[model samples]
Target chain A: ESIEWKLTANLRNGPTFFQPLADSIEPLQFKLIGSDTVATAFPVFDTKYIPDSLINYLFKLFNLEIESGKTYPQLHSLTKQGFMNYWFHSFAVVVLQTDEKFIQDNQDWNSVLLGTFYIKPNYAPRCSHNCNAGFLVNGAHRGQKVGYRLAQVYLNWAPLLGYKYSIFNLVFVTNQASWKIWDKLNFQRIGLVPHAGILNGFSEPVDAIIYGKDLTKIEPEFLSME
Target chain B: ESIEWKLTANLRNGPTFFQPLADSIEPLQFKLIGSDTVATAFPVFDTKYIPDSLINYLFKLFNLEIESGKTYPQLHSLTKQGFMNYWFHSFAVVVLQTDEKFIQDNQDWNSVLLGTFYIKPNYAPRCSHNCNAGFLVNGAHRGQKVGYRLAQVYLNWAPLLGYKYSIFNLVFVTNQASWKIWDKLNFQRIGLVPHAGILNGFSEPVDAIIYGKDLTKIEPEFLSME
Candidate 1:
């Protein structure tokens, strides 16, 4: 229990620009052991604003019975509740605490693993229908599947949080690794914005591909397109 | 003395656009030699426009003389000229009467040496300033300093024929050796338009430098800013 697992919220407050809000608020550190540990990890009932698409998908997949009057705010408030019920939990941040042995045995934390993810509500009103998340893993941990794991975890948990699509902005064209992986995982390249990033002395104009996995359509053909 | 270099009074009529003129005018083949002609040394000129400035400088420096009344063309006209000069004359299109020996001897035929210049007047008012020139040399002429000598000769001869500036556009950025010669010989960088020229899979933003030893200018400090 030395490596503390805790869930924190409201990392930022007051009027501020979009970048700060997008950066603030991260999942508290925590480890998982039991099978049901992840589901009951955080409060999920308070957030009431879960959109109909989210609720419908969650109901179909998880088969959890949600009580009425669970608003978006209520679903979000579950981040503070730290408990679960018979019905489904929409959105909650989880923290994992690790013992010294766990940290030492993992070996990932020794030279790298300095990373976190921010799964906040979409900042832009026009795009609030969808939520965007950003992840950062230490360079030392690059080859160890950290990004793939983060992406998988986020994709699985996003639908339950009432979001239909996950959007990553300004992906570099030269980033073949991420592009190939995401493409293989069924994220369709919906758009390409050229000259999105600069590299070396010359400005390397690359394409920014918008990849998304549609929760509404889960047919084999559509899923395999990734 | 039989082949007198006549300074054309109608330099303004020199072709400004290149393709058509290059298609029509046949390049002259000749060997250029210095004090020693035993080795069969030479350089050739393309059917391209030599900037009046460089031509002017060469004439004055070498004290080379040409027939009178054929003053070089102005800046405004040369800009309109789309003539491309080549060192390896007919490297791309020549077939009949082509010098197979010159092509074979120079593995880097790209750096061929032929010492004569060619020019043809444009037919219409719009294309009048366009002209083509070429410089090629034979294989047995290695290390005879033919290219430099020929360049100096062209610099002297160009202005007398009415070229405002010798325009060598789309010179590959990586062609540093010749460009270094161009720089040492005094070429001014007018523009660095990126990706204007594509090579292989990568589009290299080529440089468009206007070398004008004959243009209006002050004294030179000679330090390269780039």
Candidate 2:
């Protein structure tokens, strides 16, 4: 007699990756605001070839984000290997503070890191061309506009990375900072999933907003409703 | 010099499962139609304890479905092991034709399997209570109303498996047969994702409908507009 166990797994994963890394990802400049300046040109570097030290830094920040339970869907802690498997399965890039002095003095990448993000396929096979991304901006650096710059970087890089579209499947409605950035970046509110998560400190489950953008469109707002 | 390779992977995975399988899942009898009579009450069994032969039969049907490309998100053929990892990760059930003579005559489960489906969590830990599912029915048995019975079994079993809500994230706009069953069963069309998939043999991408239902609701239509 075998008892059929309750199925509890969620958050589908493991899509194929695009091959052959780029020799270089040219850094694009953007306006940083809030605590916040207007023209801070942070050098966004592709993290593929970076040392494990930097990867761990990104992992640490991401782990903190996951622990917050308000933004991402991950409800438990992830091992560094698990984080690598999830984030580095495709293209991941990082932004940093220009303080090379703090980087060399502290020996901790976190001291100088501003934000990071990964752009990967959102679905398997036939839908692999449409990508999804996850971003982590240092909590202390919020309102300084690091997220907006990452949004801009995502918009620019998604197409260069060969994705025609971008879909953010689970942007928490509770995370106003997130959706607001995407809205400013012109991502459409394509869908809303109700009661999507049992977020931290919430009495009831929270909703999620699905945001999407077309990488090829010059004016992303033009409709094809016909 | 390093090429930051394209992020080609999609279809997020890896969530915790609810543990301790059911000691027994009471078989529910339902109607089998078309070539069969409308009043057929075929018994369904929990497929947790599967013969490799039966599992293989399920895998073949699912692989064929993936190949069809219009239905599932998977584009590549999955191995039997991979199939088990994906489909059998949670509670799965099967309905077989009660032809004792045919069952004894043929070792192939396909000769008897009417339909099969898996119920698993659709999101990560915080949202794991909202489950998702996938299905496989013998194409030859299409008009027999096997899919509808399987749907009935899902709504019955999911809540028993401890899920409070159910969500189908990618019911392709093109897959009318699937959406119709969910609609008839009172699953609301909560959201629509535009250009969700790049299906096989199609020049344009496909849209997906996000369906959701509250298991606690008796009528399901009386859902609070969250």
Candidate 3:
């Protein structure tokens, strides 16, 4: 870790205003593409807070993603513990296919979980106002609008968490799905790092673009309607 | 920690060609400006291995640098343990004003040490081929060419340690003394992160430059003239 005792989800006692997800925001309700069904994104603080089955599903999806080696830079497999500490140690929102209310012990995680994203401070203290995030969509839920909505809700959730800016440090040029969403959301490509990653199966190293957006200015769809 | 068990100095059995300092390299010698004196830099593995007085000096200098709030992103004072873990938990080199060899514990580190630097991997796996470093010259030893030479020697050492590239992640725009060295040494200003840091005593947040260089291509002075 370049910086130690860095910013974390435990911002309750720290300086600055850190608004927890569920306190000031509404659950994201949206339609699941190619289906006549609906899903909701509930704000979550950590993967550990969820059921073991849902966390394991996320762990499995991440391992497969790392195994593919097309998007992320992790070169090795991670244990469930490792995955939780990395992705779930921070603020996150998980999309699930259910009515607005879970209504007790009836919901099963494996079939309902669609996608999720985690947000944390990107850099050390001096630039800590800017946030960075990692998003994961269940491969089984591809072509659905889960990832896109996760991104949209992210803009709201992070700023509500008191982040002034959002930056993705390494969005590989080879990943159209990611940049397309960020670009559609009007995030700027601030900088490009050449030969950034020697990705798996790539003939040569791929370049990565740094994406950033000022969170204060929300788009029309994301703007709160008073 | 974004990447747990991240690249650390404990690479003895790790999957790296980590050549410890003393086993393969010789001491560096150079002349001090504004005097008829000389200095030498010896490779060091950890600050704890050095005399405690010298480590305290480094801590003091770093805190002062942070107090100026110009270069680094740290917003608070660091304890001695924290400073060592951040700066010297990896490979390092320390400059001192003595002959090449320290014969029989005669050298007092506080009076002789001139400057020092530490090297470590800059990113996670797949992109870990690039390395990053932090440097500090003794404020008392100002007006000397210690930093320039340290930068020059870093090129050789990081490559020898199996890194293909060297990068300084955040050289603040106001830090002329830092970027000047990289610019003079032919390191490219590859990218600029806008409003990267909220520095002390500045009206506006300062931007930061990401400097990089190909380590395999040695400059004239550093090339092995074999």
Candidate 4:
């Protein structure tokens, strides 16, 4: 029997938690990180996941900061620091250790091949069944396909883990490399954050996109196999 | 007859414009020595000649510079270069001297000052009556009633120079000291530009006021004996 581990990650910062069940990531843990950070982080397989493009955009924005230590602070300022110091509250850092056969370091994540997700607790209670996540890679090792591999791993692993949707925000328009990979991966466009990153020391709010791969039918098929 | 000399003395390095002037200073004979080596040089008069407080404030602000030989461009950003350079375009350099008692040293002028009346070349098509003027003083000699004496002198002298009124802008509300002096002088406030000067590092725009004094009546009546 495969042992399922629940993973927690903040959108701005990398994955910082690990668990055996996806359902274990509680609402408070989700909410605490929500107040201080810009975006929310959750694997699609998490049981409490809710799908919202805004949340998804927040995740994408977080992914842009992959290995930069400024991940948490930058995300928090955009979300809550405008009003006060602490808004987006929680961060989930996850580590993936895969067998040689399953591991494919997708070329996009060559910078640092890492990701973090942030999840806000107040997103949409009605759409609780749907979930959102953000991703980021480290600076030292970009363009190595590590990001692509990690993203693909999440796509294949999220349904079993608990989430239903993924979101990316503040995608650097100049980051042509990332857009090409994600476009091919079937992630659909939903919104634009507009100049998400600064250009020439000026403001550029980028775009936000929501991508989803429904995992509802997999349960019965996997169950029958079990 | 008071024979006045119009000397265009430009000094470099420190406020060497603090040179003394008396009735003996002649426009034909006046010359700025060591012009190449000297960084910043201007001309001044007794405290009784300058008319407004803004020039005094600017003089003090510039005097606050610790190190010498740095131009306004070297000290501040390009955007702010217009402020100091405009002093040259807006005002004329006048030195007061007498045949018997000529300006020889800095200490000779009891109230070393700067006085200038504005010319509206902008209204080139026969507009002559409308005019503005201002003043400045050596900060080291402030608070001894020097500014008031200079204002009294300039009020008498300005009319002969053809100015009807004087205007000054960007007065600080917190500067109660100057407010009391201007109020006592019966200067009228016409308008206020709010949050004009930067206080601290923050861009807190303050109220800039337009104050004008009638030069026509004050000039002849005050300078009757001189």
Whose lDDT is greatest here? 3
lDDT string for model 1 (B116-168, tens) is 33433311222122223333333244455555544544444444344333444
Docking class of 1: incorrect
Q: Which segments of candidate 3 are over 4 A away from where they belong?
A: A1-23, A33-36, A46-48, A101-110, A221-226, B1-23, B33-36, B47-49, B102-111, B221-226
Tens-digit lDDT string for candidate 4 (A1-226): 2223233332322221212234333211111111331212233323223223323333444435432322221322233223111223433333222212111333333321244433331122222223344445544534445455445444544443333334443244445534755665655553332212323222332322323334333323222210
Assess the local accuracy of residue A122 in candidate 1 as a C-alpha lDDT between 0 and 100. 37
- Candidate 1 Cα errors over 4 Å, as ranges: A1-114, A200-202, A215-226, B1-226
Off by over 4 Å in 2: A1-24, A34-48, A99-108, A218-226, B1-24, B33-48, B99-108, B218-226
RMSD of each: 25.9, 11.5, 6.4, 22.5
Question: Which candidate, 1 or 4, has the higher lDDT?
Answer: 4
Top of the candidates by DockQ: 3
What does DockQ give for each predicted structure? Answer: 0.01, 0.54, 0.59, 0.01
How close is chain B to the truth by TM-score, in each candidate?
0.40, 0.78, 0.83, 0.50
Q: For residues A1-226, what per-residue lDDT tens digits would candidate 1 score against the true structure? A: 3212221222221111122213222232322222122211122222342233333322322221112111111111222223222122223332122322122222323232333344544322222324455444445444544444455555544544444445553344556545645775676664443332223233332334444455334444422212
On lDDT, the stronger of 1 and 3 is 3
Q: What are the runs in model 4 whose C-alpha is more than 4 Å off? A: A1-226, B1-85, B90-101, B105-129, B176-178, B201-204, B219-226
- lDDT values of the candidates? 0.33, 0.65, 0.71, 0.35
lDDT of 3 by residue, B101-199 (tens): 431143564567788888887777777777889888877777676687778778767776667777787899898755557887888887777777888
Give model 3's docking category: medium
Candidate with top TM-score is 3
- When candidate 2 is compared with the true two-chain complex, its DockQ is 0.54
